[model samples]
Target chain A: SLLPVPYTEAASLSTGSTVTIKGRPLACFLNEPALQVDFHTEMKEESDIVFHFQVCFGRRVVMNSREYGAWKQQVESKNMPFQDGQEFELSISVLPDKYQVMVNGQSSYTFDHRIKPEAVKMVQVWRDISLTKFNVSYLK
Target chain B: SLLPVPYTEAASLSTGSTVTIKGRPLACFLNEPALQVDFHTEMKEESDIVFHFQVCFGRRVVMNSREYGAWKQQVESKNMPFQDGQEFELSISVLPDKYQVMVNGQSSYTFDHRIKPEAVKMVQVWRDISLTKFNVSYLK
Candidate 1:
C-alpha cells in the first residue's frame, strides 16, 4: 500500500532529535512513489538561509545545499551516485552544534543546524528515502 | 534565483524508469523552488497508476495504484510509519525481470517495470524534470 502525504500536522520532528531506521534501498522506489520533505514555518519575503548535506556513495563523497527555495541538484557535488544491487550505510547526526551525515562508512556532510536545531525537530523520511540502519542521538 | 513551477511541460517519470537526484532536503524549499513529484498525469481524471514524492525535509513518499488509490494510506504498510531525524538508504534494483526496491536493508516491494527496462535508456533526474541522468547501467 502507498502512504499518504504527511502534512505538517500529521508528523513533525524538531531539533536535538535523532532516529535510526532499517529497510530496503531507496533507488528501487523511484517512479513508483515520489518522496517528500517539508518545513512548517512562515518564510520572509526574501530570506537567504540554506540547508546542506554531505552525501557519500562508493568511493566518492560530496557536499550539497540550497537557499530557502531553489530547484537545485540533489546536492552540490555529483561525485558519488548510488548504484543498484549495492548495500549502503547512512548516518545522519543532528545536534545543537551541527549536522553530520555519514553514508556507507563514509562521511558525507557537516553543517550547522541553523534554525535552533530544537525549533526544527520535525523530520519525516518517506518516498525513495529508503533505510537499513538508522540511529539518531542529539544533545539534550 | 528560485525556479518557477514547471508549466511548459508536465514533469513526469514513467514506469520502469530510474532517476538519480542531487539537491537539498525538500521541506526547507517548500513553495519556493521546491521539488515536486506529481502523479496526476492529467487533471480531473483519477489515474489508475500514480505516485508522487514532494521532497520535504527527509522525503515524503506517496503512491496510488490501480487496485489501491482510495485507501487512506495508498502504498504503505501499517507497521512502516516514517520517523523524524532518521538516516535512510534506498536501493532500486531494476532487473531484467522486475523492479526490486530495498529500503535500509529490507526488501520492500517488487513491481513490474510496466515498460522494458532496456528501452528506458534515457532516465531524467532533472529539476522540475529538466535535467537527465542518462545511460545508467543496471547491475545484474
Candidate 2:
C-alpha cells in the first residue's frame, strides 16, 4: 500500500523542466476521479494559476489556463491513462513554447504558454487518487 | 531562507521516459557536492543497484551499474551543472537504448542500458548536500 498523495505546495520553475505525478485512485469508488496540477504563484499559491492540467472521468485528460481567476479555451483528450489497483505516471515538460506533457511514454497533450514560462514559482497536485508521490524538476 | 524538502518514496517508470529532480542545496558547503540517484529493487533498497547516477565537484557526472553484487565500468564527464549553496534541476531520462541524463536542460550524458529496463522498481536520491525540495516527473 502507498501513502496518501500530498495535497499542495509551492516551488520554482524553469524552461526545459519536468515533473512527475504517480499515484492510485482511492481503491475504487462510485465517483470516478479527477487529478489536478496547478502552476501557481510562489509567494501566495492561492493567487492565479500559471497553468492547469487535470485528468477526469478516468479516461479524459484536460488542460486549461486560469488567468485572472478565470478559465481559458480548454484542451483535453477523451482517453484516460490510468489503471485500477495501481498507480500511473503523469510527466510534464516545461517548454518555452508550451507545456509538453506525456502519459507513460506517449505524447498526451501540450498546453500553450499563456504566461511567462519563468514566473511559475510553485506547483500543487491533488485529486481523487491516493498519491504515491509527486516530483518536480526544473532545468534552465 | 528556504523551507526543507519533503521526499516521496516511489514513482512509476518505463522506457523513453524521463524524471526531473528539483531542489536547492544547503546554503553553505566545503566543496560543491554530489547528488546521486539509484535504481534499486523496491523491498530491498539496501541490496543491488540497477543504475547509479551521480554529479559532483560542480563539473563531473558519473553513472554505473551494480548488479548481482558487482560494479560495472563507470561513465563520466567533467562538465559541472550545479552551483554551490544553490538549487539545480537534474533530469534523468529513460531512452530505448540508454539513460539520457541532463543538467539545467543541457545534454549531460547517456548511460547505456546495462540491465533490463523493466526491472527498475524504485528510485532513490541523496548526496553531500541538504535538500530544500525535490520532485520527480515522468514523461513518455
Candidate 3:
C-alpha cells in the first residue's frame, strides 16, 4: 500500500530554476488537477504576470503554457483531457526572463518570469496534490 | 488560514453508496488544477488486480483501469485547466453496476462499481487531502 508524503509547508526556489515532480495515482478535488508554485511578488498584487507550465495526462502531452497566457497559439489539440490512475511527469523550468513548463517531456506553459528574478524565494504545494518524487534545481 | 480536517485512518465505501468530500483544493499537481474521483479495490501483496478510477481535468475526462496494468483514455476538454488558489466541488455516486464521479457540477467518470455494493465501508483524509465537509449515504 502506498501512502502520501506529508504536505510541505514551504519550499525554496531561485531565478533560472527548474522543478520537476513525478509520481503515481495523482488526484485532486476538481475535474482536473493543477500544479501550484506560489512565490512572493515584489510587484503589487493583481498585476498581470506571465509564467509557463505544462501538463501530461498519461502517455499524451495534453497542454503546455509555453507562450504564457496565449493558450490559443501554443496548443493545437482540439479536444484533450487528463486521465486518472495514471503516472505523470512534470518538468518546470524557471528563467529570469520566462518560465518553461513541461509535462511528460513536452514543453507546456511559458510565462514572463514574474518577480525580480531574485525575489522568488519560496515554493509550496497545496490542495489535493500527491506525489512519489519531487525535484528542484537551479540553473548553473 | 484554513487547516485540514482531522486525520482518519481510512474511509470505506459500499456499492450503491454515494459520498462527497469537501474542503481540499482541486487537482493541485497539474498546470491547471482540477478535481477527480477514484474507485479502488483493496491492495494486496500477491494479487495483481489493480483498482480503477476516472479524472476530469477541466473539460477533459479520462477513464483509468488497472486490469492490464494502468492505462488511460481521454474523453474531452474545453481547452482549459483549473486555476490556482481556487476552491472547487467533488461528488461521487456509487451504484450496484457503476460509479459516477462529478466535479463542480459536471459528470466526469462512469466506472463499473466493483466489490459488494455494501462491502465498501471506509474513507479517510490527511495531508493536502483536507476534509471540510463529508456525507455518506447508503441506498436501499
Candidate 4:
C-alpha cells in the first residue's frame, strides 16, 4: 500500500549493481501469493527480459530470461527463505557471472547470466504483493 | 483500472444461479496475465473452496475444488476463448450437477460439483485483471 505494485522504473544494471526491494504479500502464504521481477531490455513491458525472477511464496522460485522474444531454459528452485505473514527485504546483486538473490539478508537463490546485465534498461516488480521500498544502488 | 481486483463479495449460489463478470486483463495476453474465481465455504480467504476456476489468458484454464485443507483432483482445459488485449464477459452458471462457464456468450468449460453448490458462502475474483462489473443472479 505504500508503493504502487507492478512498479517499474527506467534502470541500468552493471557488474556490482544491486536492486533492493521491501514488500509484503497481499494474502497469507497459504493463498500462494507471487512476486515477480523482470529486468527488461527496454522500458516497454513487452521488451525482452535480461532476467526474469518469480517467487511463488512458500513454494518455489523460477528464473529465466527472454531473448529474441522467446524464453530460454528455466531454472527452478524450492528454497524458501521468506517467512509467512512477514515483510521481506529482497536484494538482487549483479555479479559478473550471475545474479544472486538474497531474502531478508540470507542468500536464497542465484541464476547465471543468460543475457548480459548490460542489456537491462528497465526493471518491473509485480503481482500479488504490496511494495513499500524500492531502490537501485548507485555505487560502482 | 475500473473496479478493484481481488474482489470478494458475500454470495450464495444454487441451481440456475449465475455469476457474471466483466473485466479485462491488466497486461497483454502474451504476458500471460491470469484471472481466478473461487467459491469459498466461508468468508475467510483460507476457507475451503467449493469451486476454483482459474484462467491463464492465451494459455489454459484449470478448475478444482479445495476440500478440508487440501486441493482435490484438478481439471484442466486448454479451451481458450479469451481474446488478446480485449475485455470479456464471463458467466458461470450453477447447474444441478455442474458449473458451466461461458466466455463472451460461448460455452467454454465445465466442472462437476465436488461439493454442493449450497456450500458456497463467499465468492472471490482475483489476480491479474481489472474488473468493471460483477453480479450474482438471485432469481430462481
TM-score of the second chain, each candidate in turn, equals 0.39, 0.80, 0.53, 0.98
TM for candidate 4 is: 0.97
Tens digits of per-residue lDDT for model 4, A22-97: 9988777877878899999998888999999999899999999888889899999999998899999999999999
Model 2: per-residue Cα lDDT over A1-140, one tens digit each: 15433356567767767888776664232223456777876545346777888765445777777677667788867865566445677788888788887877777788888898677777766544556767777445
| Whole-model lDDT values for every prediction | 0.37, 0.65, 0.45, 0.91
Best by TM-score: 4
**Chain A (alone) TM-scores for all candidate structures:** 0.48, 0.84, 0.56, 0.98
Per-candidate fnat, comma-separated: 0.00, 0.00, 0.10, 0.35
Q: lDDT, candidate 2, residue A47?
A: 61
DockQ scores of all models, one per candidate = 0.04, 0.01, 0.11, 0.62
Q: Return whichever of 1 and 4 wins on DockQ.
A: 4
Which digits, one per residue and each the tens of the lDDT, describe model 1 over residues B1-140? Answer: 13221212233343344433322323222332223433343442233233333323333443333323442335533223223333334344555566655555667555554434433212222122222212223332
**Residue range B89-126, candidate 4, lDDT tens digits:** 99999999999999999999999999999999999998
How well does candidate 3 match the true structure in TM-score terms? 0.47
TM-score of each candidate? Answer: 0.34, 0.46, 0.47, 0.97
| Residue B65, candidate 1: C-alpha displacement in angstroms | 24
Error of model 4, residue B20, in angstroms: 1.0
- List the candidate 1 regions with Cα displacement exceeding 4 Å: A1-23, A26-75, A81-83, A95-97, A132-135, A138-140, B1-140
Error of 4 at B46 (Å): 0.4
- Tens digit of lDDT per residue, candidate 3, span B1-140? 14333223233565556677665543333333333333334332111122233333334545443333333443443433333445545577776677776666777556663344444333433323445666677553
lDDT, residue A42, candidate 4? 93
